[PDB]
Write a protein that binds this ligand. Structure first.
Ligand code: NAD
Lengths: 207, 823
């Protein structure tokens, strides 16, 4: 268990249950102590978070070119915040808020983390990425970080093999049920969480 | 007795022998106890679809000589008695009037010791205002003998004072158009007995028995059996002075021939005098059977008194012989029950109880049934005959012969007898009888008037409203009982048309009522019946509305998460007239868009252009809120309509101020930019966009909140009227009018009372008027607070902040910037 001590953690529209800031600091500490490192956030809907936190990140089909398949996370929680919501309304047409998740990997996987200035998910970057990771896409036991779009914010792609080795825990950053679609207000980010949200230094050159 | 549908019909066409009456009694007076004695005696049973008991049918048979005493037209020796159920407390005033309005007679139950209580007294003057003839029964006589052990003269004087206080109320409030309606024991309009032990008698009952032993017509015999009449035992002479020649006291007739025999049995049995009881029982001819010959104490006394003077027979006697039939009563209650001309073709048909004229059926309430979630209309035919399949004009509250508002020309699926808990279909039903109807619950909320005449006005309407102005949050104490509560709420909302159970966005289970008390009883039934599970109920909360005061300071802009879609809009207030029109069905969502626009344009000054660009109403797709399409040449605009509408439904259900429904809010979509590929204009993208833009526009249109306001009608004696104003002047109440009843000293004060000031109102009004006040409030209008909801200190802001915290929201109300596009 990597969720720390407390009640049963569940995901709701009212917010994550039994997940204070203090419990996060504990779980984060216990994670570092076991050789794990924080690499970013992952915004998604309630049922998904549940599956990830309690079942683990597992590979699945996704709408994109096969060479870019993998788990998608972002260093800046504001970016991942935009995906923390239902992507499709229910029968009546409700679109409820989601949850922000924190992704941790074994430090042993850090040698596989690289970065690039090029925009990802584009054929114009595939070559450079394949150069850095030292093999043809898709990503495997490695990860790539680069602008989600031209001039946009950074994103990180965890090759599924590496993504299935993550340990994900809830974030103390709450989604807003009365403002679904709104942008993350930086003042809603617990100063204590911001302190533990520093990202590792990624390689700009291949191994 | 078991009756066939043929027998009932044959019994229902003889209206002259029907007794429409209710029982006016305090619950702690054995109201249900005397009622039980009646149903176990005269209760009619039929020789699948069950309903909530609302009325009971009783059968009573009498002799040819008895029928000759009835001072009203009669036909035959059979009598149908409709015992219409009454509320369990005065507080349920609205339905207290409902029962009384469909009745003609009243059995007023009064206590022996305590006499007439404040409640029964208040209900009585209401019944008298409805022109209901009362007959009295002094219950709890058992207590006077066993506990108090009073003498025969003490008990008599006790009855004399009790009857005295009753006629004080009667002669005072009973309208002079009915003649002397006062009750006199000597005239068989007053009975005495104990509901508990199940015995009761009238002066007429003992008069009949001694009538032979004195070779005397019971007329002058029952005349003697009360008041100052004395039968000197030594001289065997009847006298009018309470002393003999030597100045010795004489026992009065009532104490001698009526009370003595009863006092004898009470003493013989309760003292276990085994040798007296047999002798005492024989001369009264009370024969015990097998098991009964061994009984002792109260066990024996109960049997002996039940066989000596059966309770139901004394009551049935007064009911049949002294209570007005539909024919006799409708003659003087018609003008009062008709909201139109007195010489109208229909009003006249009501006075004559004419079964041939246009139908005039009254619907007093809607009764829950086992046939799905449908309700069965309950009422009384005041004119014409109701038939199965017959097409009738269902005229609701707002209905007026002029307009076609609140009118539904539908057909009666089936007409049925309300046999207490069961249903019995019949072909038709002549005027004068109580009946139930099938297939009207979707046209009549609770009350209304059925008519077959295109020129007949509604009958005296009883003001009601489904508007949930108060609500609470239900929550199981044990997380495993969740399914039991979920089904409990689904059950609760079905037992009452005016109860609302829904789920807020947060997922909370909400129960909303029409008033403090109405919501109180519902939370009880839920935690004891529908669910039966320990519940955690939050304090009661008043329901508010969010609205705008002007047009948005500027255009509201908001883009989708994918940054490819944008919605430009602007909010503006909607005229109260219009919002009222929408709430009143005039401006209808399911109405043709062209026909509807003509109305809004001609009758409300709307640009017919905009009125045809209405995309939807809200919330629930019919509220007093509108989305108007004012875009120009937007490609694929229609392919997002379903989403935009959906968003508006949620945005109007819970506003940006503090989660409360919107009211009178017009949203004008000014412009839209969409991605070319429909893969990026799905619900997931548009819904939030529209939702947020609406919030931004709302917050820019000078936000305001509206509070619900009651209209309270209070009946109160002149003396205690001062206590009414005393309470209203600290509840922000505003007096509308103060009318006085012509003859009586009864006043009818009407005033507006903010719902958030009505909590415990009846309790305070009770004390201030000594219990003489008869409250009756219904939702009237919404009132916009002047104060700024965005200001935490202002009266509006105070409410807002308190609510926001209570909901766990950010204490401060969001600025339009939060929902506006983050540029
Ligand atoms: N989601 C983010 O936090 C994030 C961060 C940066 C960029 N992006 C952008 O979003 C696009 C993909 O969005 P996405 O990743 O949310 O959708 P996706 O199609 O890549 O993944 C599908 C969804 O399945 C859900 N899920 C449920 N159980 C899971 C499990 N056990 N393991 C893994 N996933 C599970 C995830 O929440 C995820 O949202 C990318 O192309 C990228 O450009 C997203």
């Amino acid at each position: 268990a990597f969720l720390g001590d407390g009640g049963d953690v569940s995901f709701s529209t009212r917010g994550t249950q039994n997940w204070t800031v203090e419990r996060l600091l504990q779980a984060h500490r216990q994670l570092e102590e076991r050789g794990y490192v924080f690499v970013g956030y992952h915004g998604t809907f309630l049922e998904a978070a549940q599956s990830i936190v309690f079942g683990g990140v597992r590979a699945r089909s996704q709408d994109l070119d096969a060479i870019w398949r993998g788990f998608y996370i972002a260093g800046d929680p504001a970016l991942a915040y935009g995906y923390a919501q239902d992507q499709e309304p229910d029968a009546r047409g409700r679109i409820r808020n989601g949850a922000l998740l924190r992704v941790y990997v074994p430090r042993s996987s850090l040698p596989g983390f690289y970065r690039t200035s090029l925009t990802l998910a584009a054929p114009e970057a595939a070559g450079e990425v394949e150069r850095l990771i030292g093999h043809p896409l898709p990503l495997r036991l490695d990860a790539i970080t680069g602008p989600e779009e031209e001039g946009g914010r950074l994103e990180t792609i965890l090759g599924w093999p590496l993504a299935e080795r993550t340990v994900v825990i809830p974030s103390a950053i709450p989604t807003d049920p009365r403002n679904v679609g709104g942008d993350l207000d930086p003042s809603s980010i617990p100063d204590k969480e911001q302190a533990i949200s520093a990202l590792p230094d990624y390689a700009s050159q291949p191994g | 007795v078991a009756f066939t549908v043929d027998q009932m019909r044959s019994l229902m066409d003889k209206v002259t022998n029907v007794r429409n009456m209710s029982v006016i009694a305090h619950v702690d007076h054995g109201k249900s106890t005397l009622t039980d004695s009646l149903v176990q005696r005269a209760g009619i049973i039929s020789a699948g679809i069950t309903i909530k008991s609302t009325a009971i049918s009783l059968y009573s048979e009498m002799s040819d000589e008895d029928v000759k005493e009835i001072k009203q037209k009669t036909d035959g020796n059979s009598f149908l008695i409709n015992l219409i159920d009454s509320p369990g407390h005065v507080d349920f005033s609205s339905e207290v009037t409902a029962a009384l309005r469909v009745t003609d007679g009243a059995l007023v139950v009064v206590d022996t010791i305590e006499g007439v209580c404040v409640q029964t007294e208040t209900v009585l003057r209401q019944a008298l205002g409805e022109r209901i003839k009362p007959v009295v029964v002094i219950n709890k006589v058992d207590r006077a003998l066993l506990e108090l052990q009073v003498s025969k003269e003490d008990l008599y004087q006790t009855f004399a004072r009790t009857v005295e206080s009753v006629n004080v109320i009667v002669s005072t409030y009973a309208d002079e158009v009915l003649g002397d309606v006062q009750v006199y024991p000597a005239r068989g309009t007053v009975a005495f007995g104990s509901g508990l032990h199940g015995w009761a008698f009238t002066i007429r009952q003992f008069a009949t028995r001694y009538a032979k032993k004195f070779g005397v017509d019971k007329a002058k015999m029952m005349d003697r059996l009360w008041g100052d009449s004395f039968f000197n035992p030594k001289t065997k002479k009847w006298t009018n002075k309470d002393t003999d020649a030597e100045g010795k006291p004489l026992e009065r007739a009532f104490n001698m021939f009526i009370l003595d025999p009863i006092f004898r049995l009470f003493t013989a049995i309760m003292n276990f005098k085994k040798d007296e009881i047999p002798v005492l029982l024989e001369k009264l001819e009370i024969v015990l059977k097998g098991d009964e010959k061994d009984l002792e104490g109260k066990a024996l006394l109960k049997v002996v008194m039940r066989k000596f003077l059966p309770a139901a027979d004394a009551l049935l006697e007064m009911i049949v012989l002294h209570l007005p039939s539909p024919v006799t009563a409708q003659a003087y209650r018609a003008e009062q029950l008709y909201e139109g001309p007195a010489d109208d073709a229909n009003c006249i048909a009501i006075k004559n109880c004419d079964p041939k004229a246009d139908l005039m059926l009254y619907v007093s309430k809607m009764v829950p049934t086992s046939d799905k979630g449908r309700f069965y209309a309950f009422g009384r035919v005041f004119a014409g005959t109701v038939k199965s399949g017959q097409k009738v004009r269902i005229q609701g509250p707002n209905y007026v012969p002029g307009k076609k508002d609140d009118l539904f020309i539908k057909a009666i699926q089936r007409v049925v007898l309300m046999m207490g808990r069961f249903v019995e279909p019949i072909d038709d039903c002549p005027a004068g009888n109580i009946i139930g109807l099938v297939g009207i619950d979707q046209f009549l909320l609770k009350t209304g008037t059925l008519t077959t005449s295109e020129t007949a006005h509604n009958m005296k309407v009883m003001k009601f409203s489904v508007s949930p102005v108060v609500q609470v949050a239900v929550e199981v104490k044990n997380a495993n009982d969740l399914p039991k509560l979920v089904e409990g709420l689904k059950r609760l909302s079905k037992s009452d048309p005016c109860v609302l159970t829904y789920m807020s966005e947060s997922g909370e289970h909400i129960v909303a009522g029409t008033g403090e008390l109405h919501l109180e009883i519902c939370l009880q039934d839920l935690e004891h019946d529908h669910a039966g599970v320990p519940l955690k109920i939050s304090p009661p909360v008043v329901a508010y509305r969010e609205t705008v005061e002007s047009e948005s300071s500027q255009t509201a802009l908001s883009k989708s998460p994918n940054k490819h879609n944008r919605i430009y809009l602007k909010a503006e207030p909607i005229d109260e007239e219009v919002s009222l029109a929408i709430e009143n069905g005039i401006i209808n969502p399911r109405d043709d868009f062209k026909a509807r626009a003509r109305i809004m344009a001609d009758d409300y000054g709307w640009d017919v252009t905009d009125a045809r660009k209405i995309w939807c109403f809200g919330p629930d797709g019919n509220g007093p809120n509108l989305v108007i399409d004012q875009t120009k040449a937007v490609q694929y605009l229609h392919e997002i309509k379903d989403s935009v509408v959906a968003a508006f439904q949620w945005a109007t259900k819970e506003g940006p101020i503090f989660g409360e429904e919107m009211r009178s809010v017009r949203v004008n979509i000014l412009d839209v930019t969409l991605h070319a590929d429909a893969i990026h204009r799905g619900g997931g993208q548009i819904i939030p966009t529209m939702r947020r833009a609406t919030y931004a526009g709302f917050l820019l249109a000078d936000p305001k909140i509206q509070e619900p306001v009651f209209l309270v009608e209070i009946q109160c004696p002149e003396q205690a009227v001062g206590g009414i104003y005393s309470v209203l002047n600290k509840k922000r109440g505003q007096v509308v009018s103060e009318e006085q009843r012509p003859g009586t000293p009864l006043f009818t004060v009407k005033a507006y009372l903010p719902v958030n000031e009505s909590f415990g109102f009846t309790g305070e009004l009770r004390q201030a008027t000594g219990g003489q006040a008869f409250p009756q409030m219904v939702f009237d209008h919404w009132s916009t607070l002047g104060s700024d909801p965005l200001d935490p200190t202002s009266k509006a802001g105070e409410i807002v902040l308190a609510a926001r915290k209570r909901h766990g929201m950010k204490e401060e109300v969001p600025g339009w910037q939060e929902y506006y596009d983050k540029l």
